[PDB]
Ligand binder design. Structure first.
Ligand SMILES: CC(C)NCCCn1c(Sc2cc3c(cc2I)OCO3)nc2c(N)ncnc21
Ligand SMILES: [Ca+2]
Length: 203
C-alpha cells in the first residue's frame, strides 16, 4: 500500500519549484491569489460541463469558494465546489504573470507552507487526498469518504513565519485585494461559530 501511494516529482517538476520559490520570495502573499484563480477556473469548468450534463451538479449544487482559517490547528483551507480532480489527475498533474501563464501557480503555496494537502472529489471518482512537502508526494483514498460532494480543498500547514494568514483581518484584506479571478462568490468563515450566516461574502 506504498508503491501505489508514494511518488516523487519529475526532475523538471522539482526544478520548477526552484524558480517559483526563489523568484517570488518578496511576494509571498501572491499564493492566495493563485489558489483563488484555480478555484475560479475549476468553477468555470463544472459550470461549462453542466451546460451539457444535467447530472453535473448533483453532488453539490453550489458554485462557490469558501476560505477558512483554523488558527488552533495552524491551517488555512481554500475550498471550491468546482470540477474537482480524479486520482489520476492528482497523481499525474505535475513572474507574477508567468506563474499564471504556465499553470504552476499552485506551488506558490509552498512560499508560506511547510506542507500542502489537497482533498478533491471529482464526479467520476472517489474522494482522494494528495499531500506533499515539495520533495515527494503521496495520494491516498480519503478514509472519510465523500465529504466534499464535489470540488477541492487546498489545506496549508503554515510556516511559523506565516502565522498572520491564520488571522481573519489578514485573510479578509487579502481576499478583497485579490478578487481578480472571481465571478463566483468568495466567502471567509467569519468565526472562531455555529450557523451558515457566519460566512462573510468577500466579493
Ligand atoms: C490537467 C488538470 C488536472 N490541471 C488543471 C489544474 C489542477 N487544479 C489546480 S492546480 C494544481 C493542483 C494540484 C497539483 C498540481 C496543480 I498545477 O498537485 C496536487 O493538486 N487547482 C485545482 C482546483 N482547485 N480544482 C480543480 N483542479 C485544480
Ligand atoms: Ca458519479
Amino acid at each position: 500500500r506504498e508503491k501505489s501511494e508514494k511518488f516523487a516529482f519529475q526532475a523538471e517538476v522539482n526544478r520548477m519549484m526552484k524558480l517559483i520559490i526563489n523568484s517570488l520570495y518578496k511576494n509571498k502573499e501572491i499564493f492566495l491569489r493563485e489558489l483563488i484563480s484555480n478555484a475560479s477556473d475549476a468553477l468555470d469548468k463544472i459550470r461549462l460541463i453542466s451546460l451539457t450534463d444535467e447530472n453535473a451538479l448533483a453532488g453539490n449544487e453550489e458554485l462557490t469558494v469558501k476560505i477558512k482559517c483554523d488558527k488552533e490547528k495552524n491551517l488555512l483551507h481554500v475550498t471550491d465546489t468546482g470540477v474537482g480532480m480524479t486520482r489520476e489527475e492528482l497523481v499525474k498533474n505535475l513572474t507574477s504573470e508567468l506563474i499564471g501563464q504556465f499553470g504552476v501557480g499552485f506551488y506558490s503555496a509552498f512560499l508560506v507552507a511547510d506542507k500542502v494537502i489537497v482533498t478533491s472529489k471529482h464526479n467520476n471518482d472517489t474522494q482522494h487526498i494528495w499531500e506533499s512537502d515539495s520533495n515527494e508526494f503521496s495520494v491516498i483514498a480519503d478514509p472519510r469518504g465523500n465529504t466534499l460532494g464535489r470540488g477541492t480543498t487546498i489545506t496549508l500547514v503554515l510556516k511559523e513565519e506565516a502565522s498572520d494568514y491564520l488571522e481573519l483581518d489578514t485573510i479578509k484584506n487579502l481576499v478583497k485585494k485579490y478578487s481578480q479571478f472571481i465571478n463566483f462568490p468568495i466567502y471567509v468563515w467569519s468565526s472562531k461559530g455555529k450557523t451558515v450566516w457566519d460566512w462573510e461574502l468577500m466579493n
